[PDB]
Amino acid sequence: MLPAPKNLVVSEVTEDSLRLSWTAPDAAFDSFMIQYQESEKVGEAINLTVPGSERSYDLTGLKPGTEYTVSIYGVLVVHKLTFPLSAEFTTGGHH
Amino acid sequence: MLPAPKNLVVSEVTEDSLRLSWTAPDAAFDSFMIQYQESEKVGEAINLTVPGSERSYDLTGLKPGTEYTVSIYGVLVVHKLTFPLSAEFTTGGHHH
Numbered sequence: 001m002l003p004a005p006k007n008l009v010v011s012e013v014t015e016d017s018l019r020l021s022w023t024a025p026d027a028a029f030d031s032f033m034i035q036y037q038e039s040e041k042v043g044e045a046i047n048l049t050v051p052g053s054e055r056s057y058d059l060t061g062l063k064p065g066t067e068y069t070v071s072i073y074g075v076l077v078v079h080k081l082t083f084p085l086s087a088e089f090t091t092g093g094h095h
Numbered sequence: 096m097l098p099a100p101k102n103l104v105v106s107e108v109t110e111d112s113l114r115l116s117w118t119a120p121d122a123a124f125d126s127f128m129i130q131y132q133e134s135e136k137v138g139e140a141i142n143l144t145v146p147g148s149e150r151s152y153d154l155t156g157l158k159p160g161t162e163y164t165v166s167i168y169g170v171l172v173v174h175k176l177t178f179p180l181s182a183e184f185t186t187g188g189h190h191h
Contacts, residue, residue, distance in 0.1 A: 004180045070181065072180050082097065083098070084167065086164060088134050089163055091161050093159035
């Protein structure tokens with residue numbers, strides 16, 4: 001429902017890490033979904049979560065001189081109601 | 096997203112109360128929402144929450160010989176995703 005996080009950049013890069021930074025509105029998301037994969041084809045994308053109050057994450061364990069595609073999703077816990085089950089009852093005694 | 100609680104009955108009725116009873120799968124819900132109102136008209140519907148492990152609730156302080164419309168909803172917790180924001184970054188060092 002709510003619009004995606006914005007402004008995905010790195011604040012730090014090393015030979016085996018990417019320190020992600022992003023923005024999102026206050027109290028908007030319960031978590032962030034982070035998906036990263038080598039921009040080539042060395043398998044499948046890895047998924048991680050981060051608390052929704054956080055705006056940075058140290059992606060570690062990476063290969064040197066390698067381009068990664070990084071996707072961030074805001075995760076929203078929605079509290080939904082089922083289709084109502086309804087009935088009429090009459091209290092005892094005289095109206 | 097998912098189908099509903101079931102079998103809404105009263106287990107007990109007095110001149111100013113309705114003891115509600117229902118069924119639901121164990122741990123299917125975290126809470127139930129109960130809405131009730133006089134079936135004619137005397138204001139607005141009242142809402143209350145009850146823990147999701149309960150299958151019974153006493154509606155209190157009602158009027159005698161009066162029909163009430165009762166609705167019960169299970170509260171479901173859903174995880175939603177936004178559209179992704181994607182970017183490419185290159186790690187430091189050389190690309191062996």
